[PDB]
Design a protein around this ligand. Sequence first.
Ligand SMILES: CCCCCCCCCCCCO[C@@H]1O[C@H](CO)[C@@H](O[C@H]2O[C@H](CO)[C@@H](O)[C@H](O)[C@H]2O)[C@H](O)[C@H]1O
Ligand SMILES: CCCCCCCCOCCOCCOCCOCCO
Lengths: 199, 199, 204, 344, 344, 344
Amino acid sequence: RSDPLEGFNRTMFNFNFNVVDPYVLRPVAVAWRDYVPQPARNGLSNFTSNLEEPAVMVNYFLQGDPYKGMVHFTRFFLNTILGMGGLIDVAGMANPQLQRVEPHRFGSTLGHYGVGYGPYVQLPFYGSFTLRDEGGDMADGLYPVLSWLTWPMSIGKWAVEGIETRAQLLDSDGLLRQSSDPYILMREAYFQRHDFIAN
Amino acid sequence: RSDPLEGFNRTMFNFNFNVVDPYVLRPVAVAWRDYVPQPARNGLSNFTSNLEEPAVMVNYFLQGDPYKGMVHFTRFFLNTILGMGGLIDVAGMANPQLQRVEPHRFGSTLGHYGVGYGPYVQLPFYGSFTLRDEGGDMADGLYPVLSWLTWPMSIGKWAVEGIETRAQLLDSDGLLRQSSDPYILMREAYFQRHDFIAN
Amino acid sequence: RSDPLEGFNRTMFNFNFNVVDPYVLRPVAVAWRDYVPQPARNGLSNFTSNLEEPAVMVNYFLQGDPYKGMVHFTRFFLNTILGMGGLIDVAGMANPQLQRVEPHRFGSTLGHYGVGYGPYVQLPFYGSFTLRDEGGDMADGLYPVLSWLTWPMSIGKWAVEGIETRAQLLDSDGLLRQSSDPYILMREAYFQRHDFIANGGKLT
Amino acid sequence: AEIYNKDGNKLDLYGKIDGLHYFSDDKSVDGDQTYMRVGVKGETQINDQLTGYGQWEYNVQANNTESSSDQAWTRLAFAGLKFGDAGSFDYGRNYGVVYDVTSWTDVLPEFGGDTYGSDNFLQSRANGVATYRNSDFFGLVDGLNFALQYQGKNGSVSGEGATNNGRGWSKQNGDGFGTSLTYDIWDGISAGFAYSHSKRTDEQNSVPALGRGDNAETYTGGLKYDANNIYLASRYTQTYNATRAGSLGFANKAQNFEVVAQYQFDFGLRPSVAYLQSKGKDLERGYGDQDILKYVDVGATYYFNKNMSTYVDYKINLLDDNSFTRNAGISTDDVVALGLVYQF
Amino acid sequence: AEIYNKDGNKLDLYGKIDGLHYFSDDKSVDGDQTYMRVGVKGETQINDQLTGYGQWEYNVQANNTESSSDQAWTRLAFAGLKFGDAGSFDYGRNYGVVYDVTSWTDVLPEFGGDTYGSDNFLQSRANGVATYRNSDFFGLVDGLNFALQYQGKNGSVSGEGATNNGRGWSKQNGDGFGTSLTYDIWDGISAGFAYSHSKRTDEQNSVPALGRGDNAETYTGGLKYDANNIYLASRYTQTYNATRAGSLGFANKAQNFEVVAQYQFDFGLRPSVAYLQSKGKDLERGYGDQDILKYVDVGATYYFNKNMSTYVDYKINLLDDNSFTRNAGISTDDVVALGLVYQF
Amino acid sequence: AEIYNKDGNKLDLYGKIDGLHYFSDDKSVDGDQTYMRVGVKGETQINDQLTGYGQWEYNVQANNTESSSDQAWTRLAFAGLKFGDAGSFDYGRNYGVVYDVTSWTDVLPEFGGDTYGSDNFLQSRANGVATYRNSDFFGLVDGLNFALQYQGKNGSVSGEGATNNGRGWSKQNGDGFGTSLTYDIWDGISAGFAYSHSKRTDEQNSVPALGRGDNAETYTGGLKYDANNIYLASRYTQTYNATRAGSLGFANKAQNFEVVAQYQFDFGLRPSVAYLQSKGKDLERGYGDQDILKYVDVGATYYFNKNMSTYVDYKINLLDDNSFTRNAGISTDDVVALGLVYQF
Ligand SMILES: CCCCCCCCCCCCO[C@@H]1O[C@H](CO)[C@@H](O[C@H]2O[C@H](CO)[C@@H](O)[C@H](O)[C@H]2O)[C@H](O)[C@H]1O
Ligand SMILES: CCCCCCCCOCCOCCOCCOCCO
């Protein structure tokens, strides 16, 4: 379909799939799954998620729907001020239309206003980078919460989110490994997940 | 039945019956009934009645009955202080035995001590007038509540009260008029009300 | 039963039984029962009894039993602070386990460790006196609150209690006066009541 | 109102809100005087014989700004046990027993009871009072009620005469005691006597100008008739070093007397006539015999039900305008009072 | 909460505890502001025609020491009767009728409603107010409500203008009166007008240096919309010698204006936008035309249920720092507030 | 007492009246000490997951005159949410978390719990604390309880360090935090630890005479046994710049220690023995190491039932009368206290 840089990508993906993942990151995720207790996993996941919910709000406004804009205002506010800086999902306990949901950020608004993705890069150590979503999302580091992160903090957040994401995927490892071509499937999942959030 | 001035009276009464009543007064009372809303009538009725309750009180004391004397103390007291300067009949709502009754005053006091009426005059615009009651009643404009009025205010008060009672009799108009000799009925009614208040 | 002074004792008892009791005291106890109203009797009895409850505790501690030790602490504290210096039995109405009971004092603890009575003196006007219990109980006038009494106060308390005890016995006096050997019963009743108080305790 | 009664415990949240306005030439008295009272009364049955209880009652002034100071205060707070046939005993801040007979004349719609103050030895509410009470004289003499009471020193804010709860001479006191006796003679008629005796503080005898004496005593006798909707009551008391001479100190000798008459009408109005009078004798500084208080009181109150009432009250104040009335800050002007009162 | 309702007597114990914190560059506003409200509401039915009532409400600040002073004060306390279709009458410390319309803009999460103060010529709660109220205009004009109200002098603490409950010029007043009228038009829209008129004390016109005039009046009109989870409201007031110029006195003329818009989300959050403004004219020391208050206010409250809610509120303060702000003591700085609120 | 429970909301009106008297050679301690407490505790059920709450409790001193000042104060007022068992959170005026173990020795009949004060960093009741609490440690260890807490500056009345809720040092503080951990071990036995850490205000480090330091730290451990009608408890805390040296300032270092033993008799009496001691080290001005508190305490309380109780408590006070006690305002004298207590 796309992939002008399919050759470039497939080499970065095979480096990621069979060098960094078996030798690091996934071992780092097995230590995570066996040594950090489930409450600390739920608390970190909510704490990081919470720093994006002000931007999810500002972007639901731009995509025309100020109702969900204030669902994520309410999520940020109950959870920052009463849920211990985001550690507890109070809003989720308070009401069903305040459950945590996947971020809709500046890439989404760009995609919802019909802007096309980049080519499709696959990066070493990173994973998948479109010019519109990853990186377009960086526009949300111009206004507060994420403009408050130093560059060290942004990677810490990046890391713990990643190791957790890997840690959750630990139990369906396979079918990326028992699959004729795991680059085309991994990429297909990419665009289906990313087109859904740009709605 | 007594009546030494019956000749004079019957001619003043016919002046009151067939020129003063149809040409003025009753037109003013039909206007009253159709243009002044019922609450303002209830308040005006209550307000003027209220100024007579200090005199009814002092006169029940003079007649040996200090109980009803203070029935009219409390009526003045609740209605001046809680019923807005007399507009609302609070005492009347507070207890059946403080409901409004017709004033007694100094004519009553004379009649209760056996004094007896004058002759019986009928006046050209006033109406039935005895020297003991309509005339003796003036004794209560000597001490406060009623000594505070301009002579204009006492003329105002008579007027408003007369127009209201006139307005109420409007639907029993047609049955003093369907009667032979209406001076005799008007005169007996006078002496029955006035002897009843003296007992 | 030992009684080295039995000869002496029966001489004083006949003085106490048929001169002091009919000629005085029992007249004093009927005047008490006929002229002092029952509340002032209960207030006086409670008040004097209360002066002994600090001592009853101090000796229940000395006998190995601190549970009833503070039962009598609770009695002293409730009744002195809330019962008007002891006049009202507040502890008694507050709970069945704090009812007044007859004192266990230093004679009791001496006896509970087995010391022994001695003879059995009988005194004129006094009644029954052992060197171990009467007199041994006097050790409890060395620590408060019973050490706080002047000797006049000690005589009053014995007098008021004595007249009251006689006043209550007024209805059974008449049934000791005919009964063979009225010295033996009074001596046995003493040692029956006084041996019960060394481990064991009941009263009114 | 009884708001709790489960497990042998009763709880009563009670009070009144009184919208009230004073008309008087005296600008210390004239104006708005709206206030409110709230309190708790609690009872706990301990045994069949024993019952424990407590009460607190608060006075809150609703007639000044929200920036204002000292608008609330505690008038009562005490706990006790009641033994039934053996009486009752309690401690806290509570009424002096002199008030067990003096209370009979404190029934006007708004005034009265001001021959004395509060925190004025044992004539009204005071800090630190233990009071034994017994009804029907130890269950012996039906209808005769007596009381005995002691009060510890309530001294200076600082100095040798200090206590924790210090205050000024006008409301200090030494150790003292009082006693009360009341008898229901016929039925509706009642006689009462009360006696009081307190040490007075070194400051009482040095900083105010009027009144010296080691002690502060009061003798009181009173009578009352209360039947067939008539209420007649009267009270005479003499005081030594106990009655305050306004702000100038205490009256060395003083005689107080009160008379009140009330009828309760079929229809809900209770009028009130009364006379009250307090005379200070052997005052110092040239103030010979001076009047402390003197007025006729005319008034009436209407009850709508057990919960709502209204009243007017007219204090016809007969004090002359002396050098002594003014230097003590004793008000000489009349006063009229209107009040509307919700109670719960 | 209705804690009593037996035999035509009802008692309501109500209040709120609000843990609340202010962030501000102004060290007078910044820090803990936790406070508490407690009150009682009482109803007694006398007849079918007549019913009597009372209410008291207390504010006590939990944001200081236990040794700290003046942390409590009475906000409301009044009793009254309700006559059915002849209305109601009350007396006590209560809200001015001016607040019958200006209350329509007093709906912010925590700020707002500060173009006026308490104890300020019947714009909000005041000492000594008698208030007649009538709903549906004597049962005639359904949905038209009017109120009439009078207030006596509350003068200086001492001196010729003194009364019993004296205070400082900023909350004094002579005799005055006010009235209010409000109409519910086509379900949800509502119009209202309010007028007030009071004499000013000699101290008002001598001590503060700013504000001269014999009387103090206010003219108010307001509209509001309350339907379909939308709430819009606005209010305009003119005042003469009535609006305070902070500590410097009163504004001889002042025009006050408020706008509020709110939406209520099904999930429980209610955001709020508002703009507020008070501009004072002809001030007396060269100040001329000065602004007294001006800010945009953005905030929101999340309601968990009828009993628990939380809120944030952000006052964006548009006052510049004049010689007049910095001499009247008017806060120039922004303020953010977070509060968690239990109410019962 | 539970006075409301309708629609999943519960309201509790609670308190106590304590008629209480102190005997002491120290005239600041001696005399009447009657007081009363009243408060509300409230609950509303929101979901199955979420439930909200608040509570306030008031201290009213009934042991002075009705003309007296500052007799009332708020000891608690806070609201919060409780997350099933993801924990709970609240904000307001509430107990410091150091008190989660230190409370274990604060059980004497009337004294004790005075190695620290209220408004003393996070050791007792404090203004402006947010407190997270969690039981059974996130479902990880049944019986281990954890707590975290922060407090913002409560500064001077004026100056750069000022806040809205200003005060003097000894009850000021900078921003601070504390944490506590307690474990229910075998049966009755419990271990606890607490740490507190707060910035100290510029005024603390400038105006008093004793104590300098940027921070104020607290480390505390304690054990307790509570089974078979025995209660034993002990607590050791070390302090840096945190415990007050009476009037002179703070002790730069101090070690505080408390031990208490109690038995509860089936018939209702609970006797208590305790020893308490606070020693402050490296103090300035020549004082060196001095004792702040040191006394044996003997007493007992009789419980009539859940609602009425009495006690005597004897503080056998072993402090010497130094140049330092007399200059810090430290009471050297013994004191005995008798109290009768109604509770509801
Ligand atoms: C829970 C179980 C109950 C525990 C029982 C009680 C524990 C007993 C502790 C006793 C400790 C007293 O120990 C001792 O105290 C005294 C009195 O303060 C100190 O003495 C100090 O004060 C005294 C007088 O107050 C001064 O004259 C003296 O110069 C000074 O040193 C001693 O230096 C110390 O050694
Ligand atoms: C200001 C002085 C007032 C003193 C007045 C006392 C009067 C006592 O009178 C008792 C009257 O009782 C009569 C019975 O009640 C009447 C009920 O029926 C009324 C008939 O109209």
